[PDB]
């Protein structure tokens, strides 16, 4: 198999290519009021790139407690353009959101949904946004779902909406 080091290298290259190909502007810090332009992403301490489209409510999730649901469009980009999840937007008719509790980790059994659908990266923005918030992200594999950690795959969330289950 490919060394961890080579995996980091292929990903680093794929991300620079992706940023350049889409003409994105990488910030060092949060912009004024957490307002972003369509093409701006802040690079967080843990390695995930974030754009906030909609900041949501003032409420903040509590680790190990808050029950969440999400809808998103998530895609690969390093070796292909395959769409992996599509339960947001016009073509997501009949789909339901995906459930997790804030603080959950991605298990390494391929028969558990968290292996594919939960990650530290998907959850990072919950430090900064609230209910019905919408975000865009590039999540490197170190912070990704176990499925993606194992294959060294970064993912791109074209759009992701958070739903707090307690306010339903």
Spell out the domains of the chain, with CATH numbers in brackets: 1-168 (3.10.50.40)
**Other CB atoms within 10 A of residue 75 CB:** 16
**Other CB atoms within 10 A of residue 70 CB:** 20
Method: X-ray
CA atoms within 13 A on the CB side of 36: 24
Judge contact between 64 and 73, C-beta under 8 A. Answer: no
Can you tell me which residue has the tokens 């620079």? 16
Phi, psi of 134 (to 5 degrees): -135, 135
Q: Cα(114)–Cα(89) distance, rounded to whole angstroms?
A: 23
CA atoms within 13 A on the CB side of 21: 8
User: What are the b/e assignments for 48-60, b being 16+ CB within 10 Å?
Assistant: bbbbbeebbeeee
Q: Resolution, rounded to a tenth of an Å? A: 2.4
């Amino acid at each position: 198999g490919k060394s961890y080091t080579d995996m980091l290298k292929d990903e680093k290259k794929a991300i620079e290519r992706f940023i350049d190909d889409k003409g994105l502007e990488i910030l060092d810090d949060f912009p004024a009021d957490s307002v972003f332009k369509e093409n701006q992403f802040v690079l967080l301490d843990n390695g995930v790139y974030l754009n906030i489209i909609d900041k949501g409510s003032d409420q903040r999730a509590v680790q190990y407690k808050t029950k969440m649901l999400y809808r998103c469009k998530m895609s690969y980009f390093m070796d292909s353009t395959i769409v992996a999840i599509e339960n947001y937007g016009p073509h997501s008719n009949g789909t339901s959101p995906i459930a997790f509790t804030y603080g959950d980790y991605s298990k390494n059994s391929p028969y558990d949904p968290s292996y594919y659908y939960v990650s530290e990266g998907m959850q990072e923005p919950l430090k900064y946004v609230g209910d019905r918030a919408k975000v865009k992200m590039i999540v490197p594999f170190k912070r990704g779902a176990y499925n993606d950690q194992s294959n060294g795959q970064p993912v791109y969330y074209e759009i992701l909406e958070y739903i707090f289950e307690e306010n339903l």
